[PDB]
């Protein structure tokens, strides 16, 4: 007796200790304590469709993210008022669009950290089982591609306008290998190529992120150059140059758990297929986590 619906969700956090941090107090005036009885309820022999590319939960999140946008991200649970309930998909290798066998009724979503970043998704949830390629329409190269990794790679950023990020080159190459492999499955065993972004918006062409009050804009050219896929001086630590901008020392490490990609058109009659980092906007960062959830009215 459920139908697809949209309702004003409310946030719930584990915010405590009345800190000076802005991200935490915001979860006291606008949010509520986390549910002490977080129980799921499996649906017997129920199969239903999903579509994260039309999920209104993403819009409500963003709007709530903007409010605090007007320091460290903390997990936020999105719940429903009386009369509504959240469905949750547990098909492991579900690409975020289509029928879902393993549906379960949850009261709220898990703890999601509103990490704002571009190109690379940080501190997100990892894909169980295999790597998952996500898109509203893969055949349409204009539609965003969300790569959901199943093994995180640490990025260690340091600030001596000067800054740089350090990544284990050997590990990143292993991951990208499996990314190309999984991409190579969708198209037709075609040659998968990664390339740096050309001219465009600053958000699309460089890895942007925050660090307790520091806005980084890192150069991810070395990360997506096929000099290290398939040896040379690639093993060891890659040092990505970065820069600070105001729109002693300090360090911040993060989990690379996903990648936003854009596939190149035109190259349709060739044997290869090119991809570049950066794509979509901030809403897709939330969409990378809210893919399994969907609201329905009772």
């Amino acid at each position, epitope marked *: 007796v459920w139908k697809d619906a949209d309702t004003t969700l409310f946030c719930a956090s584990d915010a405590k200790a009345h800190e000076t941090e802005v991200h935490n107090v915001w979860a006291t005036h606008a949010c509520v304590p986390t549910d002490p009885n977080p129980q799921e309820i499996h649906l017997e022999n129920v199969t239903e469709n999903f579509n994260m590319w039309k999920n209104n939960m993403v819009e409500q999140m963003q709007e709530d993210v903007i409010s605090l946008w007007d320091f460290d991200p903390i997990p936020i649970h999105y719940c429903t008022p009386a009369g509504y309930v959240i469905l949750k998909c547990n098909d492991k290798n579900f690409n975020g669009t289509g029928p879902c066998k393993n549906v379960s009724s949850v009261q709220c979503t898990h703890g999601i950290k509103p990490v704002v970043s571009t190109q690379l998704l940080l501190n997100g949830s990892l894909a169980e089982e295999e790597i998952i390629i996500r898109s509203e329409n893969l055949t349409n190269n204009a*539609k*965003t591609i969300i790569v959901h990794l199943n093994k995180s790679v640490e990025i260690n950023c340091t600030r001596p306008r000067k800054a740089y990020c350090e990544i284990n080159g050997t590990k990143w190459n292993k991951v990208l290998k499996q990314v190309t492999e999984k991409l190579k499955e969708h198209f037709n065993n075609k040659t998968i190529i990664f390339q740096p*972004p*050309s001219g465009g*918006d600053l958000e*699309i062409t460089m890895h942007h992120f925050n660090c307790r009050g520091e806005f980084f804009y890192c150069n991810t050219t070395q990360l997506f150059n096929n000099t290290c896929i398939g040896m040379k001086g690639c093993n060891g630590t890659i040092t990505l140059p970065c820069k600070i901008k105001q729109i002693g020392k300090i360090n911040c490490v993060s989990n690379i758990t996903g990648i936003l990609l854009t596939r190149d058109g035109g190259a349709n009659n060739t044997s290869n297929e090119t991809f570049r980092p*950066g794509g979509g906007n901030i809403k897709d960062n939330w969409r990378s986590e809210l893919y399994k959830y969907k609201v329905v009215q009772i």
Partner: antibody
Amino acid sequence: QVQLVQPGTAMKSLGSSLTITCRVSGDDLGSFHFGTYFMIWVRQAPGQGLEYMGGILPSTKTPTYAHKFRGRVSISAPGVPPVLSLALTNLTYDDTATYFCARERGRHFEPKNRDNLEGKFFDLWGRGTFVRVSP
Amino acid sequence: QSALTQPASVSGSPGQSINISCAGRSDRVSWYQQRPNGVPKLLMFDVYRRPSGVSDRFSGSHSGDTAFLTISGLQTEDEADYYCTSHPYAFGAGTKVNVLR
């Protein structure tokens, strides 16, 4: 609010040199700060058509030119905010023309339809600098 | 870096419809409108996509090898020089559109 500012006119004598500049203005966001956009120059002699003569991606120190203008012209963009420069040398009467600067929109996202565009076009143009080569 | 051919001139009365061909490259084509003594303005990109502010009277199209620009219901405001380009960049000769008054 963002605009490409050009001087306007340049009266030069035959055989002299000149450097036209194209600076961004009203850049509150700082979108041009890191030189992410490919910037070009375009020539248009009096009563003639537009001529793409080359450009540069300021994040790189590597300019590029059309065949006709490869060895005749020097393009660059140095500065904290990159200021696009076009250096002409030994001016001829054939160099008498209007010189526009323009941005290649480049990669960007279109929300209303949610489409990732390559942006191989020029949305933003300068007013143009008319260079007059006189005897 | 490829030569693109355009007809030198075309004219029409107010209300009529006209065509402007862009011979050679029907891939990633941009159109630019230059009114007299004015700066070139982006009219169309990616063959058929219109920037915000551009009237829907303008329409893009391709025919395999040649791109097209249609102007339905010509108006005096449309009198200008129209330039075509693809990638790699190389502007075509240009076409003068005269709107009879």
